[PDB]
Amino acid sequence: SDPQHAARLLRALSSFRERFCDAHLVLDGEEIPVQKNILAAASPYIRTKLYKIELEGISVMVMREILDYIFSGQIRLNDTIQDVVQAADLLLLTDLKTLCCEFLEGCIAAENCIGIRDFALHYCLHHVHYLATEYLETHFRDVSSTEEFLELSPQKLKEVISLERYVFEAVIRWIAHEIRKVHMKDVMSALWVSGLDSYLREQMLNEPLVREIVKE
Amino acid sequence: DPQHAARLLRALSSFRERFCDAHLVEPVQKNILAAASPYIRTKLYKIELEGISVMVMREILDYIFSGQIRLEDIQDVVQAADLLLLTDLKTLCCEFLEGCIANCIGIRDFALHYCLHVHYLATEYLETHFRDVXXXXXXXXXXXXXXXXXXXXXXXXXXXXXXXXXXXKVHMKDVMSALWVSGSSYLREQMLNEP
To answer: Where, by residue number, does the polypeptide cross the bilayer (chain A)?
Structure first.
């Protein structure tokens, strides 16, 4: 019995990176000699496409990290994450795709919150989207003070508020610019309605909101 | 994630059936086999093998993609390992022999022809139980030269053994002469029962 068998054998395959290379990966404007079976056995994409396997849009630097990942089991991630996910996506490396998801999760902050959430929607990272949605929900107050949430789009902010004072005082904070000073009427109108179901008019007018309130 | 090489090796195993860049004499994946066998690594296709059968080759070839062989009578599994230079395979074999003592004499002589601790662990069972060993079929079917080597190692039971070796006999004179100079109630006892 010896589970260290494959990890031993794979270390062997590793030094045959050079005679043994039966193909080339055509990325950027370069060719990379690869062992077509090993790459086939880990990338359902490369496999079905089975020489010159031309990859569409992946920095040669990332294929090396992904290629080393293939041989070691460890991926060098840190500014680069989304590069490695785009490739994990393209090549269908579920394994590696999960590590990137783990990594992305531990990065969730009050700035990489919305960002990480739009990004997770896009590559369809379900659980990652869940967590970032959640952080946003239970940390809105802080996010309110984020450049990601401020220079945001009015259509995005409308959905950000969607998810269940603290909010009414984030939409008004969303007016940095003569530019976003247009919906302020829509806010003061919503404010009245909410004040229907009180003490909210006062709790607001007790802050530098007055500045944006005055002009209107 | 120790679960890498093993999943990866699993998938590669599903190709054993487009990916075979070489034929073995006949059907394999060149890099894999060359990573597992230094011997095959140097022959670089048709890699012709010397002196192992197909059943045996198909055995090592499978250990390669699985991690473990189930073998269980070895004189050939090791015959091959030493040949293909599969080292850890021979180690798995050693573990299987090292603890198969009891087929206890031939082992010590098998481990020799193969330069195998296994030997050290064979001499130390024979070196001690030489008594019941004498009551074995191997030692009872042993050879002369093979005895001047065992008997002549680092004891009444010995002289008894050598006499307990004469089944029928032209070595007696050397035993008696020896016995005398050395100074056995077994032989004495055999006298009244023998012919």
So the answer is: none
